[PDB]
Design a protein around this ligand. Structure first.
Ligand SMILES: *Cc1c(COP(=O)(O)O)cnc(C)c1O
Ligand SMILES: *Cc1c(COP(=O)(O)O)cnc(C)c1O
Lengths: 359, 359
């Protein structure tokens, strides 16, 4: 049969990069493809977007994998490098890096490289995750402009912690801090990711870093989907039924007897579970498409299977197509129903899912 | 590798199979290695247990991977085959299969194979997931004994839905149904997995199918660990700190400003997130080991990073060892703290996580 599979629409991917250029017309694009391109495939997603100005990754491993696959464009290390002994590779690879701590800076200062490296000084403007705090940033910044090993000018990067919450003044505060530090400095400026791109046009600056919305999924947490912004969904989590069985009123289904039927019906069993990446937290009632038709999940999601209520004379058959999320069913709707973030849903999938690419 | 890594103890693995043979002394062992051996690695886990009587998998694809890697023991297709055109491979590969529906049985009836196949009729004794219902089982069973394509005798398999809940009579009822159907029939009997093995010695029969407990993790949600049964934990989810930063009181951390500090302190940033498989649901306060000392997670788990509270004058530094779970921190503690099942924690990890094998 066909069991568990992720179908990636290359056409929708292309459409979204172009659509985002329309939303941030004066900014270059850093296609964020970390974590296996949000579950869509690191290398294939990069090869689908040869138009991207650059690619962003979390770790050095991911960037090197890109070069190994023949990706040639600039890759930004969003978290910088974790070992000073990596600088020579970074330099030779032409990898651009963020610099947020003393270790990285002192490494830049003492290293001996055949070529200087393009750098983005990570500023802490409010997220308090990575980055140099304001009161340390000027001195830190000045040391970078004095590096032989750093291409000039030093670029400045930062990230929003609550851009999806327009009513709290978090973003405007980070923007205030970002703007104060960049005054009078050359070099490119970057602080906007999906949220900043869609909701804050003041934060576009020179480079924007689309991640989730690049895949046609909304970064917000209203019921909004990628189509609210003209972005098309790229991923479809699919599978097939491996059984259609009779069931009777009063009888429970799955582990823990979580769901009990109030009527004689027919249950379908899907070749999909959390061993594939489908949330074990999915409550009975969560929507799933069987032969194009919404049916509810009944009972606890197991490691390899999911049961759905088809109906007493439902004519579904072992073999028939199932869509966990996809065309007809945005991953957002599954996020709302299961209470799991769309970011995690599309990303926390296992190596057992097979990967298809269409268009 | 200094970042997301799963360290697998080959020797705790061996200890657990033998310890399970001591707990179920009159039953053969079906080492369940579905879903990439519960996150531990399908092929490596099989190669570590050349003593296993058989291996259990969810899908055909997994069994073929085992043959591809050189694994030669009998492999049991727990859900059977999804396509009739698969019987020829299954026969030739010497795969044993479950048979739960009409399609599979009719396939066996009219296939033409060079060799007959060993079969385990799946009986639905209460789980209502896969299997032939009691009232249809006798006729279905009889057709399998009349099959020239099926190696006689027909074996009988079933699975418990609530064996981890000794107080409800669910297990005794399934056992009652299982026993009634098996009366007078030859062929091996099997109904027990981890729970049945540890809590129900009257369900051991001929073959037991250890899954989660084989990896030294408890099946129950009673706070018990694998060590409660003499089983040693096999997996250690590890990483490293990529930053140690100053923080001030009243300042929030991570997306959504989820956590706010009541004191000046130092925060550590871990190269671990849900893009690796770590639960995004992990609440602030969840334990992590930094330099073998427990510190709490503060703020939201992100796709690639985790922040932890180290203390004001704490001397941990970027590069230092971090343990998400393993040696001084059982995955069962993390499950309780995050309210995520240990089954899902160890299994729903991504391909971003490196794999190490020790001993
Ligand atoms: C992952 C990440 C992004 C992308 O964010 P989205 O909300 O998914 O668009 C951009 N920049 C940095 C620093 C990141 O770590
Ligand atoms: C996966 C499974 C098992 C093993 O279960 P554990 O709870 O990890 O012990 C055994 N038998 C069947 C039918 C299964 O699907």
């Amino acid at each position: 049969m066909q069991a568990a599979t992720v179908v990636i629409n290359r056409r929708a991917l292309r459409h979204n990069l172009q659509r985002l250029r329309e939303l941030a017309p004066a900014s270059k694009m850093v296609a964020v493809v970390k974590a296996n391109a949000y579950g869509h495939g690191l290398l294939e997603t990069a090869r689908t977007l040869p138009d991207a100005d650059a690619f962003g990754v979390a770790r050095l491993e991911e960037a090197l994998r890109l070069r190994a696959g023949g990706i040639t464009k600039p890759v930004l290390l969003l978290e910088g490098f974790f070992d000073a002994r990596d600088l020579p590779t970074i330099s030779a690879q032409h990898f651009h890096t963020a610099v947020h701590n003393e270790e990285q800076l002192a490494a830049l200062e003492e290293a001996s490289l055949d070529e200087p490296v393009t750098v983005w000084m990570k500023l802490d403007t409010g997220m308090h995750r990575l980055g140099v705090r304001p009161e340390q940033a000027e001195a830190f910044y000045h040391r970078l402009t004095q590096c032989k090993n750093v291409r000039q000018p030093v670029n400045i990067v930062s990230h929003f912690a609550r851009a999806d919450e327009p009513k709290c003044g978090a973003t405007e505060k980070q923007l205030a801090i970002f703007n104060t530090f960049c005054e009078g400095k050359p070099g490119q400026r970057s602080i906007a990711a999906s949220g900043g791109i869609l909701l804050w046009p003041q934060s576009h600056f020179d480079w924007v870093r689309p991640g989730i919305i690049l895949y046609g999924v909304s970064p917000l947490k209203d019921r909004s989907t990628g189509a609210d912004f003209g972005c098309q969904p790229v991923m479809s989590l699919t599978s097939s039924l491996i059984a259609v069985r009779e069931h009777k009123a009063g009888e429970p289904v799955g582990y823990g007897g979580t769901w009990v039927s109030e009527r004689d019906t027919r249950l379908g069993v899907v070749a999909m579970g959390y061993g594939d990446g489908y949330p074990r937290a999915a409550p009975s009632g969560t929507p799933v498409l069987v032969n194009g038709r919404e049916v509810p999940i009944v009972g606890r999601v197991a490691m390899d299977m999911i049961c759905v209520d088809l109906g007493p004379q439902a004519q579904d058959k072992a073999g028939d197509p199932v869509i966990l999320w996809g065309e007809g069913l945005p991953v957002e709707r599954i996020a709302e129903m299961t209470k799991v973030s769309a970011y995690e849903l599309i990303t926390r999938l296992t190596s057992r899912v097979a990967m298809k690419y269409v268009d």
